Structures are given as structure tokens and as C-alpha cells.
Amino acid sequence: MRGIVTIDGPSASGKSSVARRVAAALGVPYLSSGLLYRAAAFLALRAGVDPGDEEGLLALLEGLGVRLLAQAEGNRVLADGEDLTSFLHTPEVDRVVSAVARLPGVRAWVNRRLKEVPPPFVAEGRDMGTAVFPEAAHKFYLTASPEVRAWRRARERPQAYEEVLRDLLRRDERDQSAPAPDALVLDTGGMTLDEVVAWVLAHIRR
Numbered sequence: 001m002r003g004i005v006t007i008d009g010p011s012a013s014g015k016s017s018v019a020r021r022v023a024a025a026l027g028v029p030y031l032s033s034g035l036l037y038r039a040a041a042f043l044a045l046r047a048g049v050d051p052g053d054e055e056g057l058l059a060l061l062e063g064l065g066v067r068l069l070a071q072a073e074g075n076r077v078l079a080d081g082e083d084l085t086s087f088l089h090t091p092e093v094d095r096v097v098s099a100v101a102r103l104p105g106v107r108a109w110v111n112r113r114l115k116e117v118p119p120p121f122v123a124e125g126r127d128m129g130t131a132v133f134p135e136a137a138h139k140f141y142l143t144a145s146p147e148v149r150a151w152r153r154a155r156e157r158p159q160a161y162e163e164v165l166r167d168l169l170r171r172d173e174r175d176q177s178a179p180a181p182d183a184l185v186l187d188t189g190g191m192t193l194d195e196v197v198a199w200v201l202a203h204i205r206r
């Protein structure tokens with residue numbers, strides 16, 4: 001695989017772990033777009049800025065040279081040389097990331113970073129196959145019910161399914177990229193993620 005593979009889906013749909021596994025199996029990097037949005041949210045929080053000031057947030061993001069490091073075991077984000085990754089998959093970031101992800105300048109910043117990487121790679125996100133790499137040769141979209149998404153997210157947070165589901169449902173209401181028209185759509189509530197990885201790899205290697 002010498003081009004680009006995109007794997008998009010809603011939160012906790014499995015696109016991150018599937019992308020990491022598919023990429024490892026192909027011997028190419030994977031790019032987690034969400035980790036960049038999480039980093040922008042975490043930095044805006046810690047910086048004490050009003051995230052509605054896009055100009056100031058973008059000066060902060062550009063000034064700290066925030067960069068995505070693709071490592072086979074999992075991506076890392078460094079800001080002024082500091083690895084922020086351990087602070088990004090937390091309840092506070094989950095709860096505020098939507099406020100910065102909707103800012104056009106922040107999406108442009110994330111997309112610029114991603115579009116810098118030389119192919120091949122597997123990129124995962126919400127809109128990798130639609131907004132960022134519409135030319136990708138292999139596109140996949142993973143669907144998942146709110147219930148299985150809340151169950152998976154709860155496994156990785158202090159909160160339980162009951163609360164996570166309420167949170168995800170309110171977030172869903174609050175906003176969206178649909179699958180790309182040429183993406184293979186797979187529901188991760190029917191197939192196990194191990195089966196999804198195998199199925200995605202069989203399509204890529206054909």
C-alpha cells in the first residue's frame with residue numbers, strides 16, 4: 001500500500017484501534033487526526049485563553065510547534081518538546097474538544113499538519129475520506145450504535161456507561177461528516193474489531 005487509507009467513524013467507533021492495527025500490518029504509519037484536536041483543546045484549556053478567540057488560539061498552536069509523531073504503538077503529540085499524550089484521553093478533554101473542533105481555523109491547522117505527511121499512511125478521523133484526503137485509494141467508514149460507543153468509551157474513563165451514554169447522546173445532538181460515497185461502510189456492532197481489521201486489510205491488499 002503506497003497511497004492513503006482513510007478510516008473514519010464517530011467517537012469510540014473503533015477507528016483508532018483499527019487504524020493502528022491496519023497500519024502496523026501494512027508497515028506504514030497511522031495518523032490520528034483526533035489527537036491533534038485533543039491537543040488543541042488541552043492547550044487552550046491550560047493556556048487560560050477564551051477559545052472563541054481563534055486568532056489567539058492559532059498563535060498559541062503555531063507558536064508551540066505542536067506536532068504529531070506517528071509511532072506504530074500509538075501516536076504522540078509534542079508541544080514545545082513536551083509529550084502531551086497522557087493528558088489527552090481524559091474526561092476534561094472529551095468534554096471541551098467540540099468547542100475548538102468546530103472552529104474553521106483549528107480544522108485548517110489540523111488539516112495542514114496532516115497534509116504535510118508523505119504517503120503512504122492510514123489516517124483516522126471523522127472526515128479523512130471526505131474533507132482531507134478525498135483522493136485516498138482506500139476509504140472505510142465504521143458505524144457503531146451509541147450504546148456500543150458508550151460502552152467502549154466507558155472502559156477507558158472513570159465514568160460508567162450510564163453517564164457516558166448520556167454525554168455522547170448530548171454531544172451527537174450538538175454536532176457530522178457522513179461517510180465518503182466511495183467508502184466501504186462496516187458496522188462494528190456486528191463484526192468484532194479483530195474481524196474489521198482483517199476485512200479492511202483484505203480490501204486494501206486486493
Ligand SMILES: Nc1ccn([C@@H]2O[C@H](COP(=O)(O)O)[C@@H](O)[C@H]2O)c(=O)n1
Pocket residue numbers: 010011012033034035037038097098101124125126127128
Ligand atoms: N477528523 C476529526 C477527528 C476528531 N474530531 C474532533 O476531535 C474530537 C476528538 O477525536 P476522537 O473521537 O477521534 O478521539 C472529536 O470528538 C471531535 O470533536 C474532528 O472534529 N474531526
